[PDB]
């Protein structure tokens, strides 16, 4: 009767709904009883420090478990042959065949083999021994403690920040651009130049010697003379064996481009020069805003003055400053949309341009990292649109936003939504129709009749960056071009070697199957956007429910009247778009993984011929690659893919269990539960035990969430088991 | 009384009381046990290289892995020499190498690691690194094995004459 | 929770005192016990074939718990089952771990309880505070000096145990 | 493995005692009225 102490409406509920709803509304601090704005921003600040610490404890845990139980020192000796160990297994349910089957990695105990790539990342950035992985784990435990104490400290009465501090947009932007983005990128260049570059070249540099070991033989004298090009002189040779002194140069900043020939990763001197460039740029960008000394920009002044004189945007951005600052949901939506695009950039640029030594030969790690970050990307992008819907319901004031960009977006909400409906339908009808055309014609024994459309626009883009496969002779592909001549002395020789060589995932060859799947991804991104945009724009009202704002973000329905109002809330369009997010990241990761496993065999033509129809995707990707995974255990034994073999079935179960919450709805279950309440009260020896909370069926919104969680968890666990076990079992 | 073969930490406790408040050991002695433990770990990883080279030679078609031999040299052999040079530095100049002259810097103005009684063993290990690399380029399996053995003998000899104080602390 | 004698209370001080005096006895007794080799087959590694996967340890040699460690654990399990039965079903006269919600918390002892040479509560609390401190002293001494806890117990008492 | 005893000591504690205890306490806290 007092668990949701933040909610008296839930704390007086006599049912089991109180526990569920108190657990599910716990982090929605804005909705808590008697919540002021001061207390809202100060609890968010302290709980952001708790998230900071959880991240640091998670990273310290990965470092500790690899330092303790991993084979990092064995792996760094021979990184292409040794399989990295994540942590050991102590499971009292194992049989002795299971214990023997997981005893890989060169150790004497069962282990999980790491798919996270942390070995390649820690190898590349300098770590050599278990002592420094452990030292990193210790330092992160200290930092986690520092940020937990900071979270407690900024909850103390003298140390409580005011709302004037929390909304100082200019000082926060100045410091996050110049200190958090820029100076830490500059400090990361210092780590590469001072530690990672020398230790990639055999010379150990630690805290014990880094003030008496110069990164460059000349040493901070060329920098303080303008002779900066002396830091690019004598780069690492193509004969360099990573981690050793043979083939090593003395340069610490280069723009060679392409990849280190042995590790098949970006040059660490390119990465050090990248973070130096991006650091200075971000530091300069962090001097943009006026704080205390009269130079800089006021964000209010910039936003108010950007109204085009033609009047096409109305009042423009007048009043957008206040809306953004006052609305934490508008900020969360901008932050999550921005972050979601970046983790999609992270997934796309880390497989094509890997930075870590001897990764991109760890095919399981490449598949897991790409799949992981694309799923994180889809979650962040859907959440951005969710919090835009929450912004419109909760924080958007139409009077304060008269004729703005925001009001005028709502004014044409139907033009936006109907054109997203058109483009979704357009793409879906044709992409599916071309795929079905191809399936029917191939089935009828006539593969030639297939509508195979070359991806010429993308091929032109590849050629424009120097791919010579398509013979476009555009820009970099043409030897005598202004673009080619300009970059010839700096990054083009390495880039042309990297792009033209077929040993890397840089600008991988694209054909008709690639075109069709890209259009499928376009239908998926447009359809998820349609559902999310329809939810955000119709969040505050619709013809079916004009006063939808008055009911909130997440409500079940408005009842069976007016024809029926199931899934009418903006939350329910989040709910419906979550399936479309899962479907699109499914199409993306299925495409990435199938194209890569076919290239990794040396059989890229198998994707080229089978991806243009859907039975090729069914038999040649899902059915063909299932066999190492589903044979992880059988009546003839088991091997170390048994865990993924069990997880794959576990994902199928959770996913299907989600269907129970999504297909079967409340009234059936409340009528079951009332017969169980009768039976418990009428059973002798059992009616001595009484519930404190009346058993009720799950709510309409709660069951939609429970089915969505089960569907999503089943989706993730099934695909993670498949993408890891098929790649591990195949090794290619 | 000795240092652990793998982790390199003090092994047993066995008025010079080990307990912190009553410890009679200097920070120099504690730095020396740290360096000696690191020397112990690097020297005891020499059998692992010897076993790997034997596996390479007895294979159906045998090739020396220059990458393995050079990466092992970079990871352990260079570390063994630097730890021994630091122990020689502390033995010769004294407290100054312990931070008495300040932060590690160029032109530290302290007596060099050479002119130490224990430096000759460091010269032996440096010759061993050169032989390990030369044999790896040559493809000589026996050369790598003997060179690693020379390093192992030199490091054990260093520790025996050093008699490092083991500070359990 | 706190209103039942749990937390930083004198009830908890007394109970942890009783457990630390017993623990000092058990540490001294196991030091004497394995010093003379009176634990049978102390080094013998238990086989997973008889005991199952709970016996696995992952120590490079043997891959199993030793028989000594299992025997000390079974001694602890005996007094844990006594502990659970005494916690849930105490004696009529015994002091109870979880006091009734409406109880009178005993006055805090202070820096030093009054000294009574008999089997008194004050004597129990004094010895209990000493034993809890003693547990910390031995655990830190063994940790700091890199010696087994059995060995530092033997060393403190002048090797009387073995 | 060094400290190989710790996985045998902690994994049952973290995996059985920790949930049991925190579930028991969570149950007491959610059900309690004052």
């Amino acid at each position: 009767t007092k668990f949701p102490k933040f909610s008296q409406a839930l704390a007086q509920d006599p049912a089991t709904r109180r526990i569920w709803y108190g657990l599910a509304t716990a982090h929605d601090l804005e909705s808590h009883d008697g919540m002021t704005e001061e207390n809202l921003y100060q609890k968010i600040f302290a709980s952001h420090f708790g998230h900071l610490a959880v991240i640091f404890l998670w990273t310290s845990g990965n470092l500790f478990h690899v330092a303790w139980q991993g084979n990092f020192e064995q792996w760094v000796l021979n990184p292409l042959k040794v399989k990295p160990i994540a942590h050991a297994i102590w499971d009292p349910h194992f049989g002795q065949p299971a214990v023997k089957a997981f005893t890989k990695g060169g150790v004497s105990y069962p282990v999980n083999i790491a798919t996270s790539g942390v070995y390649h990342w820690w190898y590349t950035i300098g770590m050599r021994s278990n002592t420094d992985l452990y030292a990193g784990s210790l330092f992160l435990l200290f930092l986690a403690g520092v940020f937990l104490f900071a979270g407690w400290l900024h909850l103390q009465p003298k140390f409580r920040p005011g709302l004037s501090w929390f909304k100082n947009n200019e000082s926060r932007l100045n410091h996050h651009l110049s200190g958090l983005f820029g100076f830490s990128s500059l400090a990361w260049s210092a780590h590469l130049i001072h530690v990672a570059i020398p230790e990639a070249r055999g010379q150990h540099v630690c805290w014990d010697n880094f003030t008496k070991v110069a990164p460059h033989p000349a040493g901070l004298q060329p920098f303080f003379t303008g002779n900066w090009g002396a830091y690019a002189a004598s780069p690492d040779t193509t004969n360099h064996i990573f981690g050793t002194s043979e083939g090593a140069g003395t340069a610490i900043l280069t723009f060679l481009g392409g990849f280190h020939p042995q590790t098949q990763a970006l040059w660490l001197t390119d990465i050090a020069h990248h973070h130096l460039a991006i650091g200075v740029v971000f530091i300069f960008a962090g001097h943009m805003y006026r704080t205390n000394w009269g130079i800089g920009h006021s964000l209010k002044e910039i936003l108010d003055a950007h109204r085009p004189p033609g009047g096409r945007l109305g009042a423009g951005h007048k009043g957008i400053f206040e809306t953004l600052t006052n609305s934490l949901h508008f900020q969360l939506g901008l932050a999550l949309a921005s972050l979601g695009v970046i983790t999609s950039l992270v997934a796309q640029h880390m497989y094509a341009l890997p930075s870590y030594a001897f990764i991109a030969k760890d095919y399981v790690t490449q598949s897991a990292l790409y799949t992981h970050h694309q799923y994180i990307a889809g979650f962040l992008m859907v959440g951005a649109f969710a919090h835009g819907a929450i912004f419109f319901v909760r924080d958007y004031d139409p009077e304060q936003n008269k004729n703005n960009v925001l009001a005028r977006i709502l004014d044409h909400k139907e033009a936006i939504i109907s054109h997203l409906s058109w483009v979704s339908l357009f793409l879906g009808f044709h992409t599916l129709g071309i795929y079905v055309h191809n399936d029917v014609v191939v089935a009828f024994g006539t593969p030639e009749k297939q509508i195979l459309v070359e991806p010429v626009f993308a091929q032109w883009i590849q050629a424009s960056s120097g791919k010579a496969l398509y013979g476009f002779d555009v820009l970099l592909s043409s030897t005598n071009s202004v673009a080619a001549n300009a970059s010839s002395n700096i990054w083009l020789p390495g880039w042309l070697e990297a792009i033209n060589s077929g040993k890397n995932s840089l600008f991988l060859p694209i054909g008709p199957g690639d075109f069709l799947i890209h259009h499928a991804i376009a239908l998926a991104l447009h359809t998820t956007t349609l559902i999310l945009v329809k939810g955000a724009l119709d969040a505050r009202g619709s013809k079916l429910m004009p006063d939808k704002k008055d009911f909130g973000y997440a409500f079940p329905c408005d009842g069976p009247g007016r024809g029926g109002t199931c899934d009418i809330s903006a939350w329910d369009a989040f709910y419906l778009s979550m399936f479309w997010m899962l479907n699109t990241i499914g199409w993306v990761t299925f495409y990435w993984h199938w194209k890569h496993i076919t290239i990794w065999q040396g059989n890229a033509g198998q994707f080229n011929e089978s991806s243009t129809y859907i039975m090729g995707w069914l038999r040649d990707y899902l059915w063909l690659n299932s066999s190492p995974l589903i044979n992880g255990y059988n009546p003839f034994g088991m091997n170390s893919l048994s865990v993924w073999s069990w997880m794959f079935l576990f994902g199928h179960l959770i996913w299907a269990t989600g269907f129970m919450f999504l297909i079967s709805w409340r009234g059936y279950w409340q009528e079951l539960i009332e017969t169980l309440v009768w039976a418990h009260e009428r059973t002798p020896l059992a009616n001595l035990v009484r519930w404190k909370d009346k058993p009720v069926a799950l709510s309409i919104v709660q069951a939609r969430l429970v089915g969505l969680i089960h569907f999503t968890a089943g989706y993730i666990f099934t695909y993670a088991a498949f993408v890891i076990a098929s790649t591990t079992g195949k090794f290619g | 009384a000795s240092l652990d073969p793998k982790t390199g930490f003090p092994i047993q406790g066995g008025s010079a009381g080990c307990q912190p408040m009553t410890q009679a050991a200097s920070i120099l002695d504690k730095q020396r046990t740290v360096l000696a433990g690191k020397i112990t770990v690097a020297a005891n990883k020499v059998p692992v290289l010897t076993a790997a080279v034997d596996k390479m030679k007895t294979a159906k078609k045998p090739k020396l892995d220059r990458d393995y031999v050079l990466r092992y040299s970079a990871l352990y052999l260079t570390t063994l020499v630097d730890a021994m040079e630091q122990y020689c530095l502390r033995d010769a100049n004294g407290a100054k190498a312990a931070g008495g002259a300040g932060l590690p810097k160029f032109k530290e103005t302290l007596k060099p690691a050479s002119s130490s009684s224990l430096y000759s063993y460091v010269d032996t290990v440096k010759s061993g690194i050169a032989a390990v690399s030369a044999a790896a380029k040559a493809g000589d399996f026996d050369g790598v094995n003997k060179a690693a053995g020379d390093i192992k003998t030199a490091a054990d000899s260093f520790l025996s004459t050093a008699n490092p104080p083991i500070i359990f602390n | 929770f706190g209103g039942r004698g749990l937390g930083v209370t004198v009830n908890a001080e007394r109970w942890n005192g009783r457990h630390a005096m017993f623990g000092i006895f058990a540490m001294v007794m196991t030091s004497y016990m394995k010093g003379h080799g009176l634990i049978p087959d102390a080094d013998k590694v238990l086989d997973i074939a008889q005991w199952g996967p709970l016996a696995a340890v992952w120590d490079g040699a043997g891959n199993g718990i030793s028989n000594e460690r299992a025997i000390i654990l079974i001694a602890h399990v005996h007094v844990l089952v006594v502990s659970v039965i005494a916690a849930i079903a105490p004696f009529g006269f015994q002091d109870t771990l979880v006091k009734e919600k409406g109880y009178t918390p005993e006055s805090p002892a202070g820096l030093i309880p009054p000294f009574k040479t008999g089997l008194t509560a004050e004597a129990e609390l004094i010895n209990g505070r000493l034993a809890m401190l003693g547990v910390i002293s031995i655990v830190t001494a063994s940790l700091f000096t890199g010696t087994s806890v059995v060995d530092t117990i033997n060393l403190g008492m002048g090797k009387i145990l073995y | 493995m060094t400290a190989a005893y710790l996985p045998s000591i902690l994994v049952p504690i973290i995996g059985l005692i920790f949930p049991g205890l925190v579930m028991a306490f969570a149950f007491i806290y959610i059900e309690q009225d004052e």
Partner: peptide, 30 residues
């Protein structure tokens, strides 16, 4: 390799982090 003493130092620092986590959670809960 990592000593048992090194693991114990890590466990000490994680206990300190646990106590600071309890203190932050109680402060956030009020």
């Amino acid at each position: 390799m990592i000593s048992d003493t090194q693991i114990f130092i890590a466990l000490i620092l994680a206990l300190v982090s646990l106590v600071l986590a309890i203190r932050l959670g109680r402060a956030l809960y009020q």
